[PDB]
């Protein structure tokens, strides 16, 4: 899938990567209920190492892409 190769550049902001990623997922053939967990997983696995390490500190109660986005942005 198109979204599957998207990775955050070492010079790219997290929110720019998130926006690209989400656009690719929304435009893909994934069914609607698969989008959010795919997005979350890509945030966790495909962001820059420092961001991956920040995301993994988030409480398990943060479950939506929007919650992770704000978690990351609010800590920059």
From Swiss-Prot:
Subcellular location: Virion
Annotated disulfide bonds: none
Domain of life: Viruses
Record site: Involved in capsid protein dimerization upon acidification: 29, 41
Function: Self-associates to form the irregular polyhedron core composed of hexamers and pentamers, that encapsulates the genomic RNA-nucleocapsid complex. Assembles as a tube in vitro. Binds to inositol hexakisphosphate (IP6), which allows the assembly of the polyhedral capsid.
Assembly description: Homodimer. Homomultimer. Homohexamer.
Name of protein: Capsid protein p27, alternate cleaved 1
Native source organism of the sequence: Rous sarcoma virus subgroup C (strain Prague)
Source species taxonomy: Viruses, Riboviria, Pararnavirae, Artverviricota, Revtraviricetes
Gene: gag
């Amino acid at each position: 899938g198109p979204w599957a190769d998207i990775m955050q550049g070492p010079s790219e902001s997290f929110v720019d990567f998130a926006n690209r990623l989400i656009k690719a997922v929304e435009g893909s053939a994934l069914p609607p209920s698969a989008r959010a967990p795919v997005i979350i997983d890509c945030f966790r696995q495909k962001s820059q190492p420092d961001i991956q390490q920040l995301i993994r500190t988030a409480p398990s109660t943060l479950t939506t892409p929007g919650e992770i986005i704000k978690y990351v942005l609010d800590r920059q």
